[PDB]
Amino acid sequence: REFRRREQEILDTALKLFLEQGEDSVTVEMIADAVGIGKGTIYKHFKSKAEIYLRLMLDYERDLAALFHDKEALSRAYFEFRMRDPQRYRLFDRLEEKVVKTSQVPEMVEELHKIRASNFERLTQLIKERIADGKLENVPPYFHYCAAWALVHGAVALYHSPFWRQEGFFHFLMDIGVRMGNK
């Protein structure tokens, strides 16, 4: 458990330092110095910094997979998962070109693509159900999840524009996604 605990403590501080100052800036030694562990004990978990990037994204899908385990309440919770903390989204967006596109450690890039596809396959099911219940305007479900993606992607860019300065607006965005494409 203590090893399982330390692996999370490394990743929690890792992602934190990855939101403050640039993920290009933070080194493995910085993470090892920030967590309070040894400069060599950190390598007992992750073999490189790109491997931290990959697991940082695997738990994201592992959490979205847990969320998929009420059709309206769990549809709203989906947009909470995507639109909360848009800096995590923009970091993974940049990380998508560095470690995933350039399959560094292909073992995890392999695993990642699977849980993204499993998470992708768990979404249309909700879509076809909300369509089968006459709530979502009956269209090809590929119409829906593209519009859902095209709104969380634009909301992260919205939250990153010179427009930061907020809760009722966030709930207004969620009510948009739930009522989006509704019959």
Ligand X SMILES: CC(C)(COP(=O)(O)OP(=O)(O)OC[C@H]1O[C@@H](n2cnc3c(N)ncnc32)[C@H](O)[C@@H]1OP(=O)(O)O)[C@@H](O)C(=O)NCCC(=O)NCCS
Contacts of 80 (CB under 8 A, 6+ apart): 174
Closer to its own copies by Cβ: residue 35 or 136: 136
Single residue of 121, 146, 171, 176 touching ligand X by CB under 6 A: 146
163 binds ligand X (CB under 6 A): yes
Q: Which does 77 bind (CB under 5 to 8 A by kind): its own copies, ligand X, none?
A: none
Residue nearest to ligand X (CB): 145
93 binds ligand X (CB under 6 A): yes
**Rounded to a whole number, what is the distance in angstroms from the first to the last CA of the chain?**
49
Contacts of 84 (CB under 8 A, 6+ apart): 170
Which amino acid makes up residue 14?
A
**In the bound complex, what is the minimum distance in angstroms from residue 45's beta carbon to its own copies?**
33
Within 139-158, which residues bind its own copies (CB under 8 A)?
Answer: 139, 142-143, 146-147, 149-155, 157-158
Contacts of 111 (CB under 8 A, 6+ apart): 58
Q: List alpha helices for 133-166, DSSP H.
A: 141-160
Closer to its own copies by Cβ: residue 74 or 150: 150
Structure tokens belonging to residue 61: 């899908």
Contacts of 143 (CB under 8 A, 6+ apart): 181
Residues that bind its own copies (CB under 8 A): 137, 139, 142-143, 146-147, 149-155, 157-158, 163, 168-169, 172-173, 175-176, 179-182
Residues that bind ligand X (CB under 6 A): 89, 92-93, 96, 116, 123, 145-146, 148-149, 153, 157-158, 160-163
